[PDB]
Amino acid sequence: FCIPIPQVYPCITARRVHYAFTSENNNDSLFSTNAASIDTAFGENAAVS
Amino acid sequence: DIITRPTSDSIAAVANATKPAAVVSDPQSMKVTPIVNPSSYVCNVCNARF
């Protein structure tokens, strides 16, 4: 699988081509994103549950 | 039979002045791979590849 790295500022993203993606929510192993920064601007804004 | 009377110097200078590059390189280019793989070629009848 290919996943974009979450960014901390509003960026300009190039249009990308994707083909694969699952059918359920198999995302439980994700802990947090941009932990060291103040906020996630573009990517998946995951936070500690 | 053919001939070619060369164009005037003035208009040539103007034309050559305005010539943007037709192939510019930038990181955000919307890349798309070929639909059919150009590497291998398959015999459509006996499926022999080359």
PDB file of C-alpha atoms in Angstrom:
ATOM      1  CA  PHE A   1       0.000   0.000   0.000  1.00  0.00           C
ATOM      2  CA  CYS A   2       1.066   3.596  -0.604  1.00  0.00           C
ATOM      3  CA  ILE A   3       0.230   6.343   1.883  1.00  0.00           C
ATOM      4  CA  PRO A   4       1.051  10.068   1.781  1.00  0.00           C
ATOM      5  CA  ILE A   5       3.134  11.377   4.656  1.00  0.00           C
ATOM      6  CA  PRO A   6       1.046  13.879   6.655  1.00  0.00           C
ATOM      7  CA  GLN A   7       2.261  17.457   6.410  1.00  0.00           C
ATOM      8  CA  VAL A   8       2.185  20.328   8.879  1.00  0.00           C
ATOM      9  CA  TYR A   9       1.382  23.149   6.449  1.00  0.00           C
ATOM     10  CA  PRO A  10      -1.087  23.628   3.597  1.00  0.00           C
ATOM     11  CA  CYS A  11       0.891  22.264   0.663  1.00  0.00           C
ATOM     12  CA  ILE A  12       0.294  21.850  -3.058  1.00  0.00           C
ATOM     13  CA  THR A  13      -0.075  18.174  -3.920  1.00  0.00           C
ATOM     14  CA  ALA A  14       0.395  16.644  -7.344  1.00  0.00           C
ATOM     15  CA  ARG A  15      -2.401  14.490  -8.705  1.00  0.00           C
ATOM     16  CA  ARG A  16      -1.530  10.855  -8.045  1.00  0.00           C
ATOM     17  CA  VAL A  17      -2.675   7.502  -9.403  1.00  0.00           C
ATOM     18  CA  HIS A  18      -3.740   4.846  -6.906  1.00  0.00           C
ATOM     19  CA  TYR A  19      -5.165   1.395  -7.453  1.00  0.00           C
ATOM     20  CA  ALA A  20      -5.203  -0.578  -4.200  1.00  0.00           C
ATOM     21  CA  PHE A  21      -7.317   0.016  -1.106  1.00  0.00           C
ATOM     22  CA  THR A  22      -8.879  -2.382   1.364  1.00  0.00           C
ATOM     23  CA  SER A  23     -12.550  -2.948   2.132  1.00  0.00           C
ATOM     24  CA  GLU A  24     -12.562  -2.414   5.911  1.00  0.00           C
ATOM     25  CA  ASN A  25     -10.958  -0.219   8.581  1.00  0.00           C
ATOM     26  CA  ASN A  26      -7.681  -2.040   9.186  1.00  0.00           C
ATOM     27  CA  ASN A  27      -5.975   0.976  10.722  1.00  0.00           C
ATOM     28  CA  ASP A  28      -5.795   0.160  14.433  1.00  0.00           C
ATOM     29  CA  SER A  29      -1.999  -0.108  14.589  1.00  0.00           C
ATOM     30  CA  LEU A  30      -1.659   3.603  13.814  1.00  0.00           C
ATOM     31  CA  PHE A  31      -0.748   5.445  16.995  1.00  0.00           C
ATOM     32  CA  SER A  32      -0.276   9.117  16.125  1.00  0.00           C
ATOM     33  CA  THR A  33       0.764  11.501  13.362  1.00  0.00           C
ATOM     34  CA  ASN A  34       3.013  14.571  13.500  1.00  0.00           C
ATOM     35  CA  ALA A  35       3.500  13.989  17.212  1.00  0.00           C
ATOM     36  CA  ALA A  36       6.350  16.487  17.491  1.00  0.00           C
ATOM     37  CA  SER A  37       4.525  19.269  15.631  1.00  0.00           C
ATOM     38  CA  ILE A  38       1.637  21.501  16.655  1.00  0.00           C
ATOM     39  CA  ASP A  39      -0.967  20.354  14.114  1.00  0.00           C
ATOM     40  CA  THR A  40      -1.466  18.270  10.977  1.00  0.00           C
ATOM     41  CA  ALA A  41      -2.507  20.443   8.058  1.00  0.00           C
ATOM     42  CA  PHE A  42      -2.997  18.111   5.086  1.00  0.00           C
ATOM     43  CA  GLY A  43      -2.540  14.421   5.842  1.00  0.00           C
ATOM     44  CA  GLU A  44      -4.380  12.068   8.169  1.00  0.00           C
ATOM     45  CA  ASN A  45      -4.878  14.014  11.401  1.00  0.00           C
ATOM     46  CA  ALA A  46      -4.596  11.123  13.820  1.00  0.00           C
ATOM     47  CA  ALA A  47      -4.330  11.864  17.531  1.00  0.00           C
ATOM     48  CA  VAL A  48      -3.746   9.807  20.655  1.00  0.00           C
ATOM     49  CA  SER A  49      -6.894   7.856  21.458  1.00  0.00           C
TER      50      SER A  49
ATOM     51  CA  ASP B   1      11.053  21.480 -58.740  1.00  0.00           C
ATOM     52  CA  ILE B   2      11.154  23.576 -55.537  1.00  0.00           C
ATOM     53  CA  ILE B   3      12.824  26.742 -54.224  1.00  0.00           C
ATOM     54  CA  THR B   4      13.067  28.611 -50.912  1.00  0.00           C
ATOM     55  CA  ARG B   5      13.311  32.393 -50.744  1.00  0.00           C
ATOM     56  CA  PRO B   6      14.684  33.016 -47.223  1.00  0.00           C
ATOM     57  CA  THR B   7      12.581  35.077 -44.857  1.00  0.00           C
ATOM     58  CA  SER B   8      13.504  38.636 -43.953  1.00  0.00           C
ATOM     59  CA  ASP B   9      15.974  39.143 -41.131  1.00  0.00           C
ATOM     60  CA  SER B  10      13.603  41.250 -39.034  1.00  0.00           C
ATOM     61  CA  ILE B  11      10.746  38.768 -38.765  1.00  0.00           C
ATOM     62  CA  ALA B  12      13.188  35.941 -38.099  1.00  0.00           C
ATOM     63  CA  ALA B  13      14.572  37.828 -35.108  1.00  0.00           C
ATOM     64  CA  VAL B  14      11.098  38.336 -33.658  1.00  0.00           C
ATOM     65  CA  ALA B  15      10.078  34.723 -34.204  1.00  0.00           C
ATOM     66  CA  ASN B  16      13.208  33.298 -32.607  1.00  0.00           C
ATOM     67  CA  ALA B  17      12.801  35.683 -29.676  1.00  0.00           C
ATOM     68  CA  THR B  18       9.522  34.077 -28.586  1.00  0.00           C
ATOM     69  CA  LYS B  19      10.112  30.345 -28.197  1.00  0.00           C
ATOM     70  CA  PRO B  20       9.100  28.807 -24.859  1.00  0.00           C
ATOM     71  CA  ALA B  21      10.502  25.394 -24.050  1.00  0.00           C
ATOM     72  CA  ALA B  22       8.075  22.661 -25.060  1.00  0.00           C
ATOM     73  CA  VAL B  23       9.388  20.192 -22.451  1.00  0.00           C
ATOM     74  CA  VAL B  24       9.877  21.660 -18.982  1.00  0.00           C
ATOM     75  CA  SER B  25      10.796  19.556 -15.961  1.00  0.00           C
ATOM     76  CA  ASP B  26       8.806  20.030 -12.754  1.00  0.00           C
ATOM     77  CA  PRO B  27       8.159  17.666  -9.836  1.00  0.00           C
ATOM     78  CA  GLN B  28       4.354  17.913 -10.041  1.00  0.00           C
ATOM     79  CA  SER B  29       3.649  16.456 -13.459  1.00  0.00           C
ATOM     80  CA  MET B  30       0.854  13.850 -13.119  1.00  0.00           C
ATOM     81  CA  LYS B  31       2.887  10.840 -14.180  1.00  0.00           C
ATOM     82  CA  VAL B  32       1.037   7.979 -15.885  1.00  0.00           C
ATOM     83  CA  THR B  33       2.698   4.704 -16.855  1.00  0.00           C
ATOM     84  CA  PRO B  34       1.919   3.034 -20.197  1.00  0.00           C
ATOM     85  CA  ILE B  35      -1.333   1.108 -20.369  1.00  0.00           C
ATOM     86  CA  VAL B  36       0.349  -1.882 -22.024  1.00  0.00           C
ATOM     87  CA  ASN B  37       3.727  -3.071 -20.823  1.00  0.00           C
ATOM     88  CA  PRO B  38       6.314  -2.211 -23.508  1.00  0.00           C
ATOM     89  CA  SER B  39       8.843  -4.735 -22.196  1.00  0.00           C
ATOM     90  CA  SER B  40       7.349  -8.069 -23.249  1.00  0.00           C
ATOM     91  CA  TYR B  41       5.449  -8.958 -26.412  1.00  0.00           C
ATOM     92  CA  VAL B  42       3.029 -11.892 -26.290  1.00  0.00           C
ATOM     93  CA  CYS B  43       1.942 -13.990 -29.259  1.00  0.00           C
ATOM     94  CA  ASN B  44      -1.820 -13.538 -29.106  1.00  0.00           C
ATOM     95  CA  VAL B  45      -2.444 -17.026 -30.537  1.00  0.00           C
ATOM     96  CA  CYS B  46       0.139 -19.275 -28.859  1.00  0.00           C
ATOM     97  CA  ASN B  47       0.924 -16.961 -25.902  1.00  0.00           C
ATOM     98  CA  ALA B  48       4.639 -17.192 -26.668  1.00  0.00           C
ATOM     99  CA  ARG B  49       6.352 -14.086 -25.326  1.00  0.00           C
ATOM    100  CA  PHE B  50       9.321 -12.198 -26.728  1.00  0.00           C
TER     101      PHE B  50
END
